Scaffold this active site. Structure first.
Site, PDB file in Angstrom:
ATOM      1  N   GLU A  35      59.026  28.797  40.349  1.00 39.09           N
ATOM      2  CA  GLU A  35      58.254  29.946  39.829  1.00 39.09           C
ATOM      3  C   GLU A  35      58.701  30.387  38.426  1.00 39.09           C
ATOM      4  O   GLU A  35      57.862  30.645  37.559  1.00 39.09           O
ATOM      5  CB  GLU A  35      58.365  31.186  40.770  1.00 39.09           C
ATOM      6  CG  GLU A  35      57.625  31.045  42.136  1.00 39.09           C
ATOM      7  CD  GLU A  35      56.086  30.909  42.061  1.00 39.09           C
ATOM      8  OE1 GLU A  35      55.519  31.098  40.965  1.00 39.09           O
ATOM      9  OE2 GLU A  35      55.459  30.612  43.131  1.00 39.09           O
ATOM     10  N   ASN A  46      47.325  35.355  34.686  1.00 44.35           N
ATOM     11  CA  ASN A  46      46.320  34.652  35.490  1.00 44.35           C
ATOM     12  C   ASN A  46      44.907  34.716  34.944  1.00 44.35           C
ATOM     13  O   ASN A  46      44.568  35.635  34.226  1.00 44.35           O
ATOM     14  CB  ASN A  46      46.363  35.251  36.894  1.00 44.35           C
ATOM     15  CG  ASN A  46      47.740  35.134  37.512  1.00 44.35           C
ATOM     16  OD1 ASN A  46      48.262  36.063  38.152  1.00 44.35           O
ATOM     17  ND2 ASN A  46      48.355  34.015  37.274  1.00 44.35           N
ATOM     18  N   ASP A  48      42.186  35.672  36.236  1.00 37.64           N
ATOM     19  CA  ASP A  48      41.500  36.908  36.662  1.00 37.64           C
ATOM     20  C   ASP A  48      41.958  38.195  35.949  1.00 37.64           C
ATOM     21  O   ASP A  48      41.442  39.291  36.263  1.00 37.64           O
ATOM     22  CB  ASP A  48      41.576  37.087  38.193  1.00 37.64           C
ATOM     23  CG  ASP A  48      42.997  37.464  38.696  1.00 37.64           C
ATOM     24  OD1 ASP A  48      43.993  37.435  37.926  1.00 37.64           O
ATOM     25  OD2 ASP A  48      43.127  37.833  39.867  1.00 37.64           O
ATOM     26  N   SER A  50      45.045  39.424  36.055  1.00 39.25           N
ATOM     27  CA  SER A  50      46.310  39.924  36.641  1.00 39.25           C
ATOM     28  C   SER A  50      47.506  39.197  35.941  1.00 39.25           C
ATOM     29  O   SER A  50      47.277  38.211  35.199  1.00 39.25           O
ATOM     30  CB  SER A  50      46.366  39.746  38.182  1.00 39.25           C
ATOM     31  OG  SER A  50      46.502  38.363  38.551  1.00 39.25           O
ATOM     32  N   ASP A  52      51.795  37.753  36.618  1.00 43.75           N
ATOM     33  CA  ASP A  52      52.935  37.460  37.538  1.00 43.75           C
ATOM     34  C   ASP A  52      54.265  37.755  36.814  1.00 43.75           C
ATOM     35  O   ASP A  52      54.421  37.463  35.606  1.00 43.75           O
ATOM     36  CB  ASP A  52      52.987  35.966  37.941  1.00 43.75           C
ATOM     37  CG  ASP A  52      51.768  35.511  38.776  1.00 43.75           C
ATOM     38  OD1 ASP A  52      51.048  36.320  39.363  1.00 43.75           O
ATOM     39  OD2 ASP A  52      51.564  34.310  38.865  1.00 43.75           O
ATOM     40  N   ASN A  59      52.671  39.189  41.693  1.00 43.42           N
ATOM     41  CA  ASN A  59      51.396  39.409  40.988  1.00 43.42           C
ATOM     42  C   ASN A  59      50.948  40.901  40.988  1.00 43.42           C
ATOM     43  O   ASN A  59      51.144  41.619  41.988  1.00 43.42           O
ATOM     44  CB  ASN A  59      50.329  38.464  41.554  1.00 43.42           C
ATOM     45  CG  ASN A  59      49.004  38.587  40.852  1.00 43.42           C
ATOM     46  OD1 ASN A  59      48.104  39.247  41.360  1.00 43.42           O
ATOM     47  ND2 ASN A  59      48.877  37.986  39.672  1.00 43.42           N
ATOM     48  N   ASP A 101      53.572  39.523  55.159  1.00 41.87           N
ATOM     49  CA  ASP A 101      52.141  39.881  55.053  1.00 41.87           C
ATOM     50  C   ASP A 101      51.229  39.051  55.967  1.00 41.87           C
ATOM     51  O   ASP A 101      50.056  39.405  56.145  1.00 41.87           O
ATOM     52  CB  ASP A 101      51.650  39.761  53.589  1.00 41.87           C
ATOM     53  CG  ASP A 101      50.292  40.460  53.335  1.00 41.87           C
ATOM     54  OD1 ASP A 101      50.186  41.689  53.579  1.00 41.87           O
ATOM     55  OD2 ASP A 101      49.344  39.757  52.860  1.00 41.87           O
TER      56      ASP A 101
END
Ligand SMILES: [Cl-]
Ligand SMILES: [Cl-]
Ligand SMILES: [Cl-]
Ligand SMILES: [Cl-]
Ligand SMILES: [Cl-]
Ligand SMILES: [Cl-]
Ligand SMILES: [Cl-]
Ligand SMILES: [Cl-]
Ligand code: NA
EC number: 3.2.1.17
Length: 129
Positions: A35, A46, A48, A50, A52, A59, A101
């Site tokens: 990562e 990203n 979209d 967003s 990270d 995110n 989650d």
């Protein structure tokens, strides 16, 4: 801060991530490697809109507030900037909520594609732990 391999393993263990939700220490070190290459200040935008953030690339769509991701949530209740600190506490506490989650460490696409099923114990080999 750019951590060494055994140095990060030790900090992750101290903060209670070793075997958290059944994932050995090697899985967490392997995820951090691919990562962020162990760099706490890593960021990546990203498609979209967003972003990270940090050693585990958490995110802004769901987990932290950066003030520039429309219609997002802040489930970890933190500014995304806290995820870039030399102290990993904020990253580890938020990763605990993410891995709980429902989908385990598959939430991290690089762990699924580069760590899942591999000899992850190699990541902590030789470390004084
Ligand atoms: Cl390495
Ligand atoms: Cl391991
Ligand atoms: Cl926002
Ligand atoms: Cl901006
Ligand atoms: Cl929220
Ligand atoms: Cl905030
Ligand atoms: Cl730390
Ligand atoms: Cl699981
Ligand atoms: Na957010």
């Amino acid at each position: 801060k750019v951590f060494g391999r055994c140095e990060l393993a030790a900090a992750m263990k101290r903060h209670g991530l070793d075997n958290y939700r059944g994932y050995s220490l090697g899985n967490w070190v392997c995820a951090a490697k691919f990562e962020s290459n162990f760099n706490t200040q890593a960021t990546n935008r990203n498609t979209d809109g967003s972003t990270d953030y940090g050693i585990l690339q958490i995110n802004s769509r769901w987990w932290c507030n950066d003030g520039r991701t429309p219609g997002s949530r802040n489930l970890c209740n933190i500014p995304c900037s806290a995820l870039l600190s030399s102290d990993i506490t904020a990253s580890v506490n938020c990763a605990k909520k993410i891995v709980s989650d429902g989908n385990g460490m598959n939430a991290w696409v690089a762990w699924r594609n580069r760590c899942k099923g591999t000899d992850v114990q190699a990541w902590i080999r030789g470390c004084r732990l």
